[PDB]
Amino acid sequence: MLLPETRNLLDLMDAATRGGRPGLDTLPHAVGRKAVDKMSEDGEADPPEVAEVANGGFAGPASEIRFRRYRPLGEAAGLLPTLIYYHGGGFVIGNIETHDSTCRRLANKSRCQVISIDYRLAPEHPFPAPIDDGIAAFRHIRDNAESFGADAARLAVGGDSAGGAMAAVVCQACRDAGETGPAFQMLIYPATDSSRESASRVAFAEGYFLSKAHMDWFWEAYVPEDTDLTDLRLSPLLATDFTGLPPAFVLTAGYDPLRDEGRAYADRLIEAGIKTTYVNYPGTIHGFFSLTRFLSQGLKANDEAAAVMGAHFGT
Amino acid sequence: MLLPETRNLLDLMDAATRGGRPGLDTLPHAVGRKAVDKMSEDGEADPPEVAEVANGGFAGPASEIRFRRYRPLGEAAGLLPTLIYYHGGGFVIGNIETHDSTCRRLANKSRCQVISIDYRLAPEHPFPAPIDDGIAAFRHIRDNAESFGADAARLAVGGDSAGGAMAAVVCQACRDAGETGPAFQMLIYPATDSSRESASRVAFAEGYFLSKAHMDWFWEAYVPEDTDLTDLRLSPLLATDFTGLPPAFVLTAGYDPLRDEGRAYADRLIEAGIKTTYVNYPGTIHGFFSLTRFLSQGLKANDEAAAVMGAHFGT
Numbered sequence: 295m296l297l298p299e300t301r302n303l304l305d306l307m308d309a310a311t312r313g314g315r316p317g318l319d320t321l322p323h324a325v326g327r328k329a330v331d332k333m334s335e336d337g338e339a340d341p342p343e344v345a346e347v348a349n350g351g352f353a354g355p356a357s358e359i360r361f362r363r364y365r366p367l368g369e370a371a372g373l374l375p376t377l378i379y380y381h382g383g384g385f386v387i388g389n390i391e392t393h394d395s396t397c398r399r400l401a402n403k404s405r406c407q408v409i410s411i412d413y414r415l416a417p418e419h420p421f422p423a424p425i426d427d428g429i430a431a432f433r434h435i436r437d438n439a440e441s442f443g444a445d446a447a448r449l450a451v452g453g454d455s456a457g458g459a460m461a462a463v464v465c466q467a468c469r470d471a472g473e474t475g476p477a478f479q480m481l482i483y484p485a486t487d488s489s490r491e492s493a494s495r496v497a498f499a500e501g502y503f504l505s506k507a508h509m510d511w512f513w514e515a516y517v518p519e520d521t522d523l524t525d526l527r528l529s530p531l532l533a534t535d536f537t538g539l540p541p542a543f544v545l546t547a548g549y550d551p552l553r554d555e556g557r558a559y560a561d562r563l564i565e566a567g568i569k570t571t572y573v574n575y576p577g578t579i580h581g582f583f584s585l586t587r588f589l590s591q592g593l594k595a596n597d598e599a600a601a602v603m604g605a606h607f608g609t
Numbered sequence: 610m611l612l613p614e615t616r617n618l619l620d621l622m623d624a625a626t627r628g629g630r631p632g633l634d635t636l637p638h639a640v641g642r643k644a645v646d647k648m649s650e651d652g653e654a655d656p657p658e659v660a661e662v663a664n665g666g667f668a669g670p671a672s673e674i675r676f677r678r679y680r681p682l683g684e685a686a687g688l689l690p691t692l693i694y695y696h697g698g699g700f701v702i703g704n705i706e707t708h709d710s711t712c713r714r715l716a717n718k719s720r721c722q723v724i725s726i727d728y729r730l731a732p733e734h735p736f737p738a739p740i741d742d743g744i745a746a747f748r749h750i751r752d753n754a755e756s757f758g759a760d761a762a763r764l765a766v767g768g769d770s771a772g773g774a775m776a777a778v779v780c781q782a783c784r785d786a787g788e789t790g791p792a793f794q795m796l797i798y799p800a801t802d803s804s805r806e807s808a809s810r811v812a813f814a815e816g817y818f819l820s821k822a823h824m825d826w827f828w829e830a831y832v833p834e835d836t837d838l839t840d841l842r843l844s845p846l847l848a849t850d851f852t853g854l855p856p857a858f859v860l861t862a863g864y865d866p867l868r869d870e871g872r873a874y875a876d877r878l879i880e881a882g883i884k885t886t887y888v889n890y891p892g893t894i895h896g897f898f899s900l901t902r903f904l905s906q907g908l909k910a911n912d913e914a915a916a917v918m919g920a921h922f923g924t
């Protein structure tokens with residue numbers, strides 16, 4: 295079943311609930327964001343040193359998109375293979391700060407540059423604003439690669455949860471528009487299907503950090519009521535054609551409601567003849583990739599994602 | 610579709626055939642071994658420098674088992690996480706020399722020690738002698754880890770084709786005997802099922818480096834007449850229980866008859882709750898992992914296998 299480290303964390307969370315700490319799904323979105331963002335920052339392992347961290351912004355579709363560039367230790371080349379990273383948080387919470395230690399570790403272990411994107415969040419900017427920012431961040435960095443110290447031939451996208459969905463959708467959007475898309479996609483327990491409930495979405499509705507109530511709280515902020523749940527920006531698993539999508543790494547957690555649709559996305563990539571790495575981390579929960587203060591499996595997952603991307607890019 | 614580099618290699622093969630070269634499947638096994646072993650040595654990328662190479666032998670079940678240890682560049686620790694590697698060659702051909710460059714690259718990229726095993730070959734030593742040697746090599750190195758500069762907590766087995774089968778069977782054998790098994794299994798396009806012909810075994814019977822005629826020539830040498838093809842040492846895919854097997858990396862090639870049964874083995878591991886990485890390299894052939902003079906994809910596969918094992922072992 296669950297690893298000891300995982301049970302330890304679920305026990306702490308259960309102790310906070312009995313200790314009267316409110317459910318996330320009972321608060322206003324902006325209030326929940328402030329509280330959970332601090333816990334996410336605190337829940338990361340200590341930030342490793344990198345060669346260089348850069349902060350800036352560029353003109354997005356409807357706002358300034360902030361970015362943070364992480365230059366890996368021991369790499370001297372001007373133009374580096376580069377991962378454009380989209381943080382998770384149901385398109386409502388998270389930011390560059392909540393995923394900073396993780397991006398630092400990914401940069402160092404991959405010997406690739408990481409560029410973390412601060413995309414617009416719901417409920418202030420509902421669907422499709424977050425994905426529009428994700429797409430615009432990829433296009434801007436692609437077209438201005440030298441500005442970002444990026445090798446345009448080795449531009450990856452990736453993220454965790456909503457960020458994973460974003461990375462999958464960025465690849466499909468570029469493919470569908472007939473433009474140059476990412477060289478690589480790193481999908482960490484992505485949400486790939488909003489149209490159906492998989493066996494895993496039912497089985498893990500409760501008891502496993504990310505609960506159905508949490509997904510509904512995110513959903514009510516992000517998605518207008520009238521929206522077709524088969525829209526490929528909500529449900530990229532439903533794409534008719536997976537050919538011409540870039541080589542992928544797809545990671546699931548065993549006790550994650552998103553596991554089945556994560557693995558189905560990998561299956562569609564494999565059947566389409568896309569170079570695809572699929573890994574399942576049994577005995578851990580959704581979020582473990584960034585909860586690395588509590589879950590050592592997350593540091594292992596960080597290193598596996600980094601190592602596979604690094605190997606694809608010949609770093 | 611086949612990758613250009615793969616078509617280039619199939620062209621060279623076709624140029625040798627119409628001309629001086631005869632079919633491998635037309636020669637006595639010991640004479641075919643000499644010719645194909647030289648092509649395998651010649652087909653590897655130039656050997657990268659490692660920190661140290663050690664040659665020795667120990668008493669196996671029925672003979673001396675030769676080994677070669679590769680110490681990775683830049684690792685100082687006395688006891689290293691260690692991959693025990695079993696070369697491919699249908700249990701008939703290959704040796705330490707045919708997989709030397711690949712083992713050097715795996716050692717350097719993983720920051721793990723590699724110990725390549727020179728197990729007994731058919732037809733001189735038919736089934737089950739090659740697997741007996743594989744099992745005895747793992748047990749000897751496990752029980753004498755400090756003698757091999759190996760951290761007993763981080764002992765992996767792996768191999769390509771027959772070597773992949775060997776690594777899978779070593780893990781099952783240790784699990785079934787109730788002894789300490791490997792910490793990790795690296796299965797490079799393993800043969801996992803001799804009992805049935807998958808869609809891929811039919812589809813790729815010819816046109817792609819190992820033809821069905823090659824598999825029959827190997828089979829004639831390795832398996833005594835009237836052997837049970839459901840024996841778990843020939844057909845580890847048919848194991849009833851995959852629980853308690855070590856964390857795995859499973860790699861298939863797209864145009865490989867072994868692809869489907871390789872992927873099925875990964876599926877059994879995932880369903881049993883084993884931490885499992887599956888990767889498919891589309892557009893390449895069986896053997897590409899060691900044909901790295903001709904196939905860049907092989908060097909990418911080398912680095913992916915190494916990086917995933919390295920990440921599991923926290924190197």
Ligand SMILES: *[PH](O)(CCCCCC)OC
Nearest residue numbers: 382383384385455456485
């Ligand atoms: P992730 O970003 C999971 C929520 C999925 C978004 C629904 C569209 O939270 C850790």
Ligand SMILES: *[PH](O)(CCCCCC)OC
Nearest residue numbers: 304307500501502503505
């Ligand atoms: P979710 O299922 C996450 C909380 C973990 C509690 C462990 C039983 O909310 C009820």
Ligand SMILES: *[PH](O)(CCCCCC)OC
Nearest residue numbers: 697698699770771800827
């Ligand atoms: P590999 O070792 C081929 C697998 C056949 C195993 C059964 C004899 O190299 C072509």
Ligand SMILES: *[PH](O)(CCCCCC)OC
Nearest residue numbers: 622623815816817818820
């Ligand atoms: P097999 O299919 C090996 C493929 C070699 C390519 C050109 C001879 O032999 C028919």
